[PDB]
A paper describes a structure:
The 12-kDa FK506-binding protein (FKBP12) is a ubiquitously expressed peptidyl-prolyl isomerase with considerable homology between fungal pathogens and is thus a prime candidate for future targeting efforts to generate a panfungal strategy. PPIase proteins all catalyze the cis/trans isomerization of peptide bonds N terminal to proline residues in polypeptide chains.
Thus, to assess if this interaction occurs in solution, we made a single cysteine mutation, V91C, in the A. fumigatus protein to try to capture a disulfide cross-linked complex. This residue was chosen for mutation because the structure revealed that the V91 and V91′ (where the prime indicates the other subunit of the dimer) side chains are within <4.0 Å of each other and that when they are mutated to cysteines in silico they could form a disulfide bond in the intermolecular dimer. When the proteins were purified from both strains in the absence of a reducing agent and subjected to nonreducing SDS-PAGE, the samples revealed the presence of two species, which were consistent with FKBP12 monomers and dimers. We next separated the V91C dimer from the monomer via size exclusion chromatography and crystallized and solved the structure of the dimer to 3.2 Å resolution. The structure revealed a disulfide cross-linked dimer. Interestingly, although revealing the same general dimer that we observed in the A. fumigatus and C. albicans apo FKBP12 structures, in the FKBP12(V91C) structure, Pro90 is slightly shifted from the active site and adopts a twisted conformation, suggesting that the structure may have captured an intermediate state of catalysis. This finding suggests the intriguing possibility that part of the mechanism of prolyl isomerization by FKBPs is dictated by the conformation of the substrate during catalysis.
Numbering used by the authors:
A (entry chain B), B (entry chain A): 1 to 111
Amino acid sequence: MGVTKELKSPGNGVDFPKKGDFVTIHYTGRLTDGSKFDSSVDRNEPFQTQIGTGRVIKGWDEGVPQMSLGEKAVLTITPDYGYGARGFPPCIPGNSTLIFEVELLGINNKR
Amino acid sequence: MGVTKELKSPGNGVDFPKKGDFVTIHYTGRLTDGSKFDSSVDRNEPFQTQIGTGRVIKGWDEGVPQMSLGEKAVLTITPDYGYGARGFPPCIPGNSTLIFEVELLGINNKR
């Protein structure tokens, strides 16, 4: 598909994020070539966002809710579920695949 | 000091960019961790700009002019002559040294 999760470390396996849930994550995204383009880990500023509401790239919206609380996975997002052909210039060229390490630290009030 | 050059390949050793010149070049930028953050070279869209007048980061304003027409060098630019404390979000963290591969394709009307 447009997004695929490799599971790297298992979450709790019951608590998954449904739509409109307020997700809290740490991540690091690279390009296929290996360049780190953004990392909430490096900034020690854990990213919070609402989920099924399209405030983040489709690959994220669609891919995160399949992680349970505490899970550590990797998201592979095709340009089509990413920043499209346009991209996010200097950082993310157009038609860029994305590889995010992702850690789910909380769903709404949960941690 | 602030920017350091490393001539990789010699230009014509006659034609140097003086201030207020319009330069044409082909560049690749990387963080100290090997991550490429921008590259006219990959876009195949050679960047053009005026040099002494602060329409690029200072590291360039002061490096590019040390190069002659045709030269390939490597600029090393401290955060201080770069993006400084703020950096450039997503791609370029705060307080980041930069390493630009640079090719001086043209000075005003020369190639």
